[PDB]
Amino acid sequence: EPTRIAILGKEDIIVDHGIWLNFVAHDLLQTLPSSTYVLITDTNLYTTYVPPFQAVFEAAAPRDVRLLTYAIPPGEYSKSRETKAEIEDWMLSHACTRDTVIIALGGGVIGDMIGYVAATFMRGVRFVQVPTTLLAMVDSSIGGKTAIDTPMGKNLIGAFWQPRRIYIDLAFLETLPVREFINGMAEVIKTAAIWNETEFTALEENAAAILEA
Amino acid sequence: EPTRIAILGKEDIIVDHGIWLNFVAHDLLQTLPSSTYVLITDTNLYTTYVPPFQAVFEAAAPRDVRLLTYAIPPGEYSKSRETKAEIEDWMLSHACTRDTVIIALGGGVIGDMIGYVAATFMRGVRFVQVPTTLLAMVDSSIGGKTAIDTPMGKNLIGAFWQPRRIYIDLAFLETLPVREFINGMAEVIKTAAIWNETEFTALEENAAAILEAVRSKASSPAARLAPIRHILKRIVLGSARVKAEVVSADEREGGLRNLLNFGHSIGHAYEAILAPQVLHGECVAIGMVKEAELARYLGVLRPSAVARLTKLIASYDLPTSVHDKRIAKLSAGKECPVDVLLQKMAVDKKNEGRKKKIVLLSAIGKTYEKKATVVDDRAIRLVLSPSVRVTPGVPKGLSVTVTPPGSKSISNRALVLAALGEGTTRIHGLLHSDDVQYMLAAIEQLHGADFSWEDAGEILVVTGKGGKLQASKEPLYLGNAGTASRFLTSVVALCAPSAVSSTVLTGNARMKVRPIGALVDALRANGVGVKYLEKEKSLPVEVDAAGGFAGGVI
Amino acid sequence: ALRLYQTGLRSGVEYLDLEMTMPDHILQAVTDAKGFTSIIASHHDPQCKLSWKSGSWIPFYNKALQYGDVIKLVGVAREMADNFALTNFKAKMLAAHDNKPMIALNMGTAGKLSRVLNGFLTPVSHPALPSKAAPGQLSATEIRQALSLIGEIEPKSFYLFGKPISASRSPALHNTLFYKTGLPHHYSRFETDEASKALESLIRSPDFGGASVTIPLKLDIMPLLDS
Amino acid sequence: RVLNGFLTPVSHPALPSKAAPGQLSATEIRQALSLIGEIEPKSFYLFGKPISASRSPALHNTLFYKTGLPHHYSRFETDEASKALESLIRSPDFGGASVTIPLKLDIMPLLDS
Numbered sequence A: 001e002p003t004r005i006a007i008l009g010k011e012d013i014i015v016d017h018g019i020w021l022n023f024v025a026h027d028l029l030q031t032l033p034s035s036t037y038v039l040i041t042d043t044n045l046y047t048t049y050v051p052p053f054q055a056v057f058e059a060a061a062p063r064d065v066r067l068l069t070y071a072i073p074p075g076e077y078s079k080s081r082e083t084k085a086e087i088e089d090w091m092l093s094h095a096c097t098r099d100t101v102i103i104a105l106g107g108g109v110i111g112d113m114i115g116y117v118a119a120t121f122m123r124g125v126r127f128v129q130v131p132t133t134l135l136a137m138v139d140s141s142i143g144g145k146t147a148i149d150t151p152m153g154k155n156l157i158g159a160f161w162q163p164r165r166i167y168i169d170l171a172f173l174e175t176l177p178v179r180e181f182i183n184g185m186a187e188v189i190k191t192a193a194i195w196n197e198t199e200f201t202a203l204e205e206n207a208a209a210i211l212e213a
Numbered sequence B: 001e002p003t004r005i006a007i008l009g010k011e012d013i014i015v016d017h018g019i020w021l022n023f024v025a026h027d028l029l030q031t032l033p034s035s036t037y038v039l040i041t042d043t044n045l046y047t048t049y050v051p052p053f054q055a056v057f058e059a060a061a062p063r064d065v066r067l068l069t070y071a072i073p074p075g076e077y078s079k080s081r082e083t084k085a086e087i088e089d090w091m092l093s094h095a096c097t098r099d100t101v102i103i104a105l106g107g108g109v110i111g112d113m114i115g116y117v118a119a120t121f122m123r124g125v126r127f128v129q130v131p132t133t134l135l136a137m138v139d140s141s142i143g144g145k146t147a148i149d150t151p152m153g154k155n156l157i158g159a160f161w162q163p164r165r166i167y168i169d170l171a172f173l174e175t176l177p178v179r180e181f182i183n184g185m186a187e188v189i190k191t192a193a194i195w196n197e198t199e200f201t202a203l204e205e206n207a208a209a210i211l212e213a214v215r216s217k218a219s220s221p222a223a224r225l226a227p228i229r230h231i232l233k234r235i236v237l238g239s240a241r242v243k244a245e246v247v248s249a250d251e252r253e254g255g256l257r258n259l260l261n262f263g264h265s266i267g268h269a270y271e272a273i274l275a276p277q278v279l280h281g282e283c284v285a286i287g288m289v290k291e292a293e294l295a296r297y298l299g300v301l302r303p304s305a306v307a308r309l310t311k312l313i314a315s316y317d318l319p320t321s322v323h324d325k326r327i328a329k330l331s332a333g334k335e336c337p338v339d340v341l342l343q344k345m346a347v348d349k350k351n352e353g354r355k356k357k358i359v360l361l362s363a364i365g366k367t368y369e370k371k372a373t374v375v376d377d378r379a380i381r382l383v384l385s386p387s388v389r390v391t392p393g394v395p396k397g398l399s400v401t402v403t404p405p406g407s408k409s410i411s412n413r414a415l416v417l418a419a420l421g422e423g424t425t426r427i428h429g430l431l432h433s434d435d436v437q438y439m440l441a442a443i444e445q446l447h448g449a450d451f452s453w454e455d456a457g458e459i460l461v462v463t464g465k466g467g468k469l470q471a472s473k474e475p476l477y478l479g480n481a482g483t484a485s486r487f488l489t490s491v492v493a494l495c496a497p498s499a500v501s502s503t504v505l506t507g508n509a510r511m512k513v514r515p516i517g518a519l520v521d522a523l524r525a526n527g528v529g530v531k532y533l534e535k536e537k538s539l540p541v542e543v544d545a546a547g548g549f550a551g552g553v554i
Numbered sequence C: 001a002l003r004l005y006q007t008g009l010r011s012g013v014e015y016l017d018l019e020m021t022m023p024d025h026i027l028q029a030v031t032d033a034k035g036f037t038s039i040i041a042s043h044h045d046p047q048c049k050l051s052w053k054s055g056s057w058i059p060f061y062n063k064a065l066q067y068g069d070v071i072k073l074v075g076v077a078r079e080m081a082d083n084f085a086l087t088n089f090k091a092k093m094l095a096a097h098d099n100k101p102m103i104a105l106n107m108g109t110a111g112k113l114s115r116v117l118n119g120f121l122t123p124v125s126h127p128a129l130p131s132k133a134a135p136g137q138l139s140a141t142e143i144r145q146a147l148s149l150i151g152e153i154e155p156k157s158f159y160l161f162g163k164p165i166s167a168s169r170s171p172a173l174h175n176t177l178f179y180k181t182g183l184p185h186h187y188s189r190f191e192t193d194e195a196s197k198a199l200e201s202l203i204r205s206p207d208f209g210g211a212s213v214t215i216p217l218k219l220d221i222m223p224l225l226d227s
Numbered sequence D: 001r002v003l004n005g006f007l008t009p010v011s012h013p014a015l016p017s018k019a020a021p022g023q024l025s026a027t028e029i030r031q032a033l034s035l036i037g038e039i040e041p042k043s044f045y046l047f048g049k050p051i052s053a054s055r056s057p058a059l060h061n062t063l064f065y066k067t068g069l070p071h072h073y074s075r076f077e078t079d080e081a082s083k084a085l086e087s088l089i090r091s092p093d094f095g096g097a098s099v100t101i102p103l104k105l106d107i108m109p110l111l112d113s
């Protein structure tokens, strides 16, 4: 039951189960053709989820097409001016051109940082979102808000830059730690509190059962 | 006469004179209301132009509105990740919120950097452009391309972010240094070369007059520019309109906007190596010449056009080659290897993957495609390289018809004796040499013939006036055109006395130490007065306006 | 100034320091008649109007680049970080223009580290002189022992080869001069009648700084050496 | 190691090894800090008379050298606790001072505590 969701006039959000290692690679190659695909995640995620995607992707991709991979350190500190430059300088090492398609694999830290890199690299290139945290599935990956932190505060420098695709593979929640789950429930509670008292009431009843599981 | 120009569906460009210290402050406050205005320029501009704007602005602004000011260091090195952070951290010190309106006062370095800050500050805020260099008035301030440099190359990180207003106050050109003027003429030449052969032709004629005025030491900086005030207005309006239209059609450079990177594919590669000591327009000039030569090698551009483009660039005192003595002097003999240039071209933003895309001129005023064309690495390497590897082999049973360039001996004569005759001659295969170009203009000013071109400059239509020439009051500059000075010395003896009894031929520093003694001896002997004005037996020479030689024995 | 500058050039001085603040007509005249004198193009920023990070030095660098054989830029350090930024700046300039070396310093006691790390033609003081040319400049010896404490001058083993060398004064000699000059090296005995395979372990070691050779090895050593 | 400041681990020549390779001794770091501006030199004084044959300068200057500090100790003969003395004592260069005959008692009013 793969359900899609419309945003800004197109059904570019897709919510399914186990799409990372089949559908996503094929959809990128068919709907967002390019010479160069850049898959960026963090150190916690890389060796678990990147190598199997590379296998699938490089088997499907045609002769003159390439997949570049890179991991940044995990956590808020990577939404920074430095990490931005680190990624960009690396991309330019491999002569990534304007046709490059970036794949943000991770939570909101990856989503925001890599999205902002995408927004500004050669004055903008295509990118997609592959949220892996609850928070990113229900909030960060949607909306196209990308930013970095400065010493002054949160998300003070950034860009509105919409991803061409948002691939929500609920299966990523399987390896997500308990703390990061609870973290994302804040954004879920928030959304219900401003918009839907019935969903709110469901969240009340489901709380005991969710934490237990 | 404040003329506005439409861009992206609104007349947000305004071109006038002396608007910085009146109109701009009021227009900001009325059309872009905010709690906070941030005016950013560079150290060279600040104390001259900011304090008087603050006075005007803070007098007009209401009680709860503020103007913040900041200067960054001048020059390319400020289009950087650091300078970006420096500005942003400063803005956030003063709790600049999202309603902030940024004012970019300066040239393209300010325009690009401050625009990119505007594009990303709180995910975007309003900003305006106040260009102060020729380049920025005719190119940088329009189009909304903002960027920074990285160690890898030019403008590799940035954003498309359109200014709400572009205030073009031509008066800023008064304090602009001579070098920065010439720098911006590269972008002016470029725009004409891709879009308008008539403006191109005007730039040719205006070159001598523009440089003279810009280098003048006249009683004020404004009176300095007054003689070419109409020319500058034509250049700025004209050049701004082309860009505005191109940008409207193709804001995000999907195709047509490629054309504005003429000379920039190769130009930005040199600039990555030679900046900040070598300026942008200087690099564009060098690149334009190589991208023209490339097109010529590919059989897309006629050689005459390449010569014509190179001569124009050089006539504005821009470099035509990376080996220019001024580039060595400024760069401390910095080398630009081909492998490094190609490495810089591989991250040119027009490129479709590994395929490099370059704007190819088809003629002066036309482009081969209405976008950048894919060029093979081998051809780009050949143009940038100093040496040639020749692969042996020519097709079996080949037969070709090749026309080399015209002989300058027969071509220089052809112009002279066509101009002196009665009737109208079309000259095919004429070598457009420096001798021809200067003799042509010489005879024009003597009212000796009417000249005209056909087939994009390959045919010279000459209607001569049968030898009825008029002595020019103004001297005739020839450069170091030998054959020209020799032919014109006897030709200008034919002209009847009109304004003055005599007419003078001058030229380059090299011309002034070049012999013409024997020919002057012949004219004096055959009843034609002629006095040397500086050195004996060489130019400049004032030669009498007789009705021809005396005749008889010579 | 012009006449003084020419007195320098006429006297055949190996280096001459002209400030970039001097008017262009004098910069031209001194540059044209420089001959085989090396020009140090200098600028000092005692009032601290410039900055290493921000790149407000570039205009002076660009000028000094075309006038000088050696660029000399001197600023002020308020905090230790200001020396890091200088070092980073210098490195970026040398990468871009290998062919014109640089003397880059921060004045004040805060900027003492910039003198240590400068490396090339660092101006120094000496205790025997009545003043210091600039406040808080270090002596060649002090800088050299500062460099040693950070391992920028890595210690080295020096040896005396031969026998009998029990009563040799070479160790006293060279160790004293090492201490006196600020170097961290050390000189020691190594008695041996032959140029052994064990000797050439020391001689080809990366710790090897040099060695004296006496009886009976003055002749037998040569085959082990390259040149 | 020089710039760390707080609880820098150090070596000592009398120990058989170094705990980590290339660690410096407290003295070495302290004289490294002195060569850069980080330990600013200070003036130390001996007040009183007669102090021509006093060993205090030998004592304290030796310990300064031995510990790696850049400070310096010197004579200042005086029979009274003068206004010129308290210029030195209240100077920002002042590191400390020994006081002997006849100023052991007359000095106290010039001191805060």
Ligand SMILES: NC(=O)c1ccc[n+]([C@@H]2O[C@H](COP(=O)([O-])OP(=O)(O)OC[C@H]3O[C@@H](n4cnc5c(N)ncnc54)[C@H](O)[C@@H]3O)[C@@H](O)[C@H]2O)c1
Pocket (backbone or CB within 6 Å): A042, A044, A045, A074, A075, A076, A079, A106, A107, A108, A109, A110, A111, A112, A132, A133, A135, A136, A139, A140, A141, A142, A143, A144, A145, A146, A155, A172, A173, A174, A175, A176, A177, A180, A183, A184, A187
């Ligand atoms: N743009 C927006 O609209 C928006 C919305 C909400 C939050 N945000 C931003 O997002 C950030 C928070 O994002 P986050 O909570 O996803 O943090 P995050 O991206 O750092 O991920 C949380 C941690 O869990 C790990 N992780 C992620 N997926 C995993 C998986 N499948 N299995 C195991 N471990 C996994 C990561 O390595 C990380 O250590 C904040 O900076 C916030 O400002 C942005």
Ligand SMILES: NC(=O)c1ccc[n+]([C@@H]2O[C@H](COP(=O)([O-])OP(=O)(O)OC[C@H]3O[C@@H](n4cnc5c(N)ncnc54)[C@H](O)[C@@H]3O)[C@@H](O)[C@H]2O)c1
Pocket (backbone or CB within 6 Å): B042, B043, B044, B045, B074, B075, B076, B079, B106, B107, B108, B109, B110, B111, B112, B132, B133, B135, B136, B139, B140, B141, B142, B143, B144, B145, B146, B155, B172, B173, B174, B175, B176, B177, B180, B183, B187, B280
């Ligand atoms: N955005 C675009 O599409 C676009 C187009 C062309 C060029 N550019 C960029 O623009 C930059 C070049 O800009 P630039 O040529 O204006 O250089 P610039 O902005 O550094 O200005 C040139 C110099 O002249 C000074 N100056 C400017 N106006 C002056 C005045 N009225 N009087 C006296 N001095 C004055 C400046 O302080 C500076 O030292 C390059 O980095 C190039 O990439 C961008």
Ligand SMILES: O=C(O)C1=C[C@@H](O)[C@@H](O)[C@H](O)C1
Pocket (backbone or CB within 6 Å): B408, B409, B410, B412, B483
């Ligand atoms: O008469 C001519 O056209 C010329 C004759 C030769 O001297 C040539 O060398 C010269 O360049 C032109």
Ligand SMILES: O=C(O)C1=C[C@@H](O)[C@@H](O)[C@H](O)C1
Pocket (backbone or CB within 6 Å): C160, C165, C168, C169, C170, C212, C213, C214, C215
């Ligand atoms: O014993 C010594 O110290 C030396 C004696 C001479 O042979 C010297 O030549 C040698 O270099 C050192």
Ligand SMILES: O=C(O)C1=C[C@@H](O)[C@@H](O)[C@H](O)C1
Pocket (backbone or CB within 6 Å): D046, D051, D054, D055, D056, D098, D099, D100, D101
């Ligand atoms: O002569 C001296 O150096 C001294 C004598 C005693 O008074 C001591 O108490 C004093 O500290 C030093």
Ligand SMILES: *[C@H]1C=C(C(=O)O)C[C@@H](O)[C@@H]1O
Pocket (backbone or CB within 6 Å): C017, C074, C105, C107, C123, C124, C133, C134, C137
């Ligand atoms: C240059 C720099 C000096 C310094 O600041 O240490 C000393 C001065 O005499 C030299 O000219």
Ligand SMILES: *[C@H]1C=C(C(=O)O)C[C@@H](O)[C@@H]1O
Pocket (backbone or CB within 6 Å): D009, D010, D019, D020, D023
């Ligand atoms: C901690 C750090 C040391 C060092 O690396 O200098 C020495 C070690 O013994 C301390 O535990």
Ligand SMILES: N[C@@H](CCC(=O)O)C(=O)O
Pocket (backbone or CB within 6 Å): B139, B143, B145, B187, B257, B260, B261, B264
């Ligand atoms: N002249 C512009 C070309 C880009 C554009 O305006 O489209 C530049 O130098 O960047």
Ligand SMILES: [Zn+2]
Pocket (backbone or CB within 6 Å): A139, A187
């Ligand atoms: Zn949130």
Ligand SMILES: [Zn+2]
Pocket (backbone or CB within 6 Å): B187, B264, B280, B284
């Ligand atoms: Zn340009």
